[PDB]
């Protein structure tokens, strides 16, 4: 599907339909809803297809205003490392030359004349820096209008289907998108029509997650830094917004607090007459549902498709309760993993949380002891995000959608 | 070649100075070469010198071996502290969360207490290696005493013979590859009680010692630089497994690096001809260099006459001085911007000269007519330096080894 035009085609649904990777984008999350009906423009717009373009323009120019801003950090980290150097000579000496007593006079002398050239250094680089800044005050400038025509983009929305289910498998925010904000702002404009949304915790998730829980405890609002600064851009599309004081902290803790936080499941479910719908981000294994118990001290049970449903329920609270308390990165918190990819029987079983959202699938994986079909006499069905790997399995679905 | 594992059977007069150009932090090269120049003798009581000899040989390969398995030791609870202070961070960190958590929180507490036990299990058994290793270090501190105790009787064995040589090191008489630095030491003290001149050029591998010595005196580990690897210094830590074990106190290190050692150390050297200057130095390096050095160091240079450059190079040791006595000589030698000190640039020894000093490696494109002139205004230049794999052709160009 081409998600940069006005839908043509559409899609009734049948209760529920789950998005399998967002890539951060929020044109594909907006083309999503419309292609679902979900979302409609309101009567007054005539012109579908130009309406839809404007904000396609807004997210571009945006675009390219975060990727300016990642040069921009680059070469920030670049020149601090020489300030660092120059810094870290210029205060040993300084204190040297502060412990001077009148005794000591050629000394002050001495420690004077070798600290001159690094201070010179020093002024130089920190003002190639200031020149950066300079450049970033600059892109401070420019955010605000982009950020006003989507606004007035957004006034030209209404909700059509509240009766849906939607399912968000992962990648939402902290992606190769644009901004979250965005995405933020249309899952609040979701929130506030009463829809039903539900997203599954995944790796560029955690990495939101784990910015945010910092910022509320006074550390910058910045991530992990496991996956690079390109691949996470459009939580950078955020974090830039909140930097420049383009939007107030406020703002973003509405609507992560309303709007994100109570959608995060570790996996999801439905129930059919005859078996159990598993939703998780990445492709996993049954036998992790057990293992993420352990950890969270969930007594696990699968005697029957309701039992498994509980346990599911169960997990997911104790998620929100590590959620409610700004706490959820103590569970992804593990060193000692080589390949959170490809985690070993011993590391799965130590950080199951970060298997279920870093896991990716191979052949070596599959195998028939992996994902069963049916279990304790009911059918098990699997759906994931997006995965290279392309399973044989008739009810496992591997979801671009 | 020499034999310095067995007692000297040759032996050889002095013309006033006398330069060995690599130590190697062995102790075995500094005897023998005291032996065979007539500096030491052995006392006329002991009859088979050759036997005494052997002793003070064994003696230092058994304590090599010692420090061998130090090294093995530290290594390993290096790494296991490693895990200690992960682990333990996280003990405090939860435990801060719980000391956080209010009455109200039942199940949160309950989560939290049971994410706690198994990071405690892998502090337990983590702290448990490292108690065994810690036995066995001190399993090695039973016995270093009694190398000590045999290399007190060897140094009761000597006597002086020659006063009227000047003796000059020309680097890495400690920190090196080299079993102990404290028998070094304990032989520059004995040189120094007996009047003897005695200059030692300070190299890459001095600094090394001498940067753990200034961190060791205002209070800090006495750890070294770093930048050679511990088993190329590994005569350090020959002396600081004695430091640490209290074989040996504090004050006895000190006493003797202050009066034996300290006061020895020349960046350069020189003696005067009736035409001209000799230059000794530990790294191949450049006349104009020299120049630099005063540029760093603020002393007024002057080369006009063999006098001048004899006074400058005085002045230059003097404010080394100064830099000694107060412990900040790593001021002049940490400068992380440099990219490569064997082959520094124009700009980078200009900035720091004296790390060009002690670590230049010449090869066939440093040799160049500019680079060491052998007449220069008004009189002869003679170049010295350690060793190093390069040879040079000129006549007045010497490559100790």
Request: glycine share 4%; hydrophobic share 35%; net charge negative.
């Amino acid at each position: 599907i081409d998600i940069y035009n006005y839908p043509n085609e559409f899609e009734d649904n049948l209760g529920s339909i789950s998005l399998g990777d967002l890539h951060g984008n929020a044109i594909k999350l907006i083309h999503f809803l419309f292609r679902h009906k979900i979302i409609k423009f309101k009567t007054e717009i005539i012109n579908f297809h130009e309406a839809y373009q404007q904000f396609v323009t807004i997210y571009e120019q945006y675009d390219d205003m975060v990727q300016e801003y990642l040069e921009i950090r680059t070469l920030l980290q670049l020149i601090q490392i020489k300030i660092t150097n120059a810094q870290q000579r210029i205060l040993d000496i300084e204190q040297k030359l502060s412990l001077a007593t009148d005794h000591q006079k050629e000394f002050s002398q001495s420690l004077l004349q070798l600290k001159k050239p690094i201070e010179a250094n020093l002024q130089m680089a920190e003002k190639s820096k200031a020149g950066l800044e300079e450049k970033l005050s600059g892109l401070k400038t420019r955010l605000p209008s982009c950020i006003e025509r989507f606004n007035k983009f957004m006034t030209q929305i209404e909700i059509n289907d509240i009766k849906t289910l939607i399912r968000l498998l992962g990648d939402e925010v902290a992606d190769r998108g644009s901004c979250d904000y965005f995405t933020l702002r249309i899952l609040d404009f979701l929130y506030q029509n009463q829809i039903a949304i539900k997203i599954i915790l995944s790796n560029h998730g955690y990495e939101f997650i784990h910015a945010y829980e910092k910022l509320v405890v006074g550390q910058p609002f910045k991530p992990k830094g496991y996956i690079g600064d390109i691949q996470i851009k459009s939580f950078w599309g955020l974090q830039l917004l909140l930097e420049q004081s383009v939007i107030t902290e406020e703002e973003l803790r509405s609507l992560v607090e309303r709007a994100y936080k109570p959608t995060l499941k570790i996996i999801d479910y439905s129930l059919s007459e005859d078996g159990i719908t598993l939703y998780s981000h990445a492709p996993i294994r049954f036998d992790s549902i057990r293992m993420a118990a352990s950890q969270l001290g969930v007594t696990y049970n699968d005697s029957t498709k309701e039992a498994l449903a509980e346990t599911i329920d169960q997990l997911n609270a104790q998620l929100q309760i590590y959620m409610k308390n700004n706490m959820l990165h103590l569970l992804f918190e593990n060193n000692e993993i080589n390949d959170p990819t490809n985690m070993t029987d011993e590391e799965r079983n130590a950080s199951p949380l970060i298997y279920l959202v870093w896991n990716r699938w191979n052949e070596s994986k599959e195998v028939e002891n992996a994902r069963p079909g049916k279990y304790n006499g009911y059918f098990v069905t699997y759906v994931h995000g997006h995965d290279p790997f392309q399973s044989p399995l008739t009810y496992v679905y591997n979801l671009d959608t």
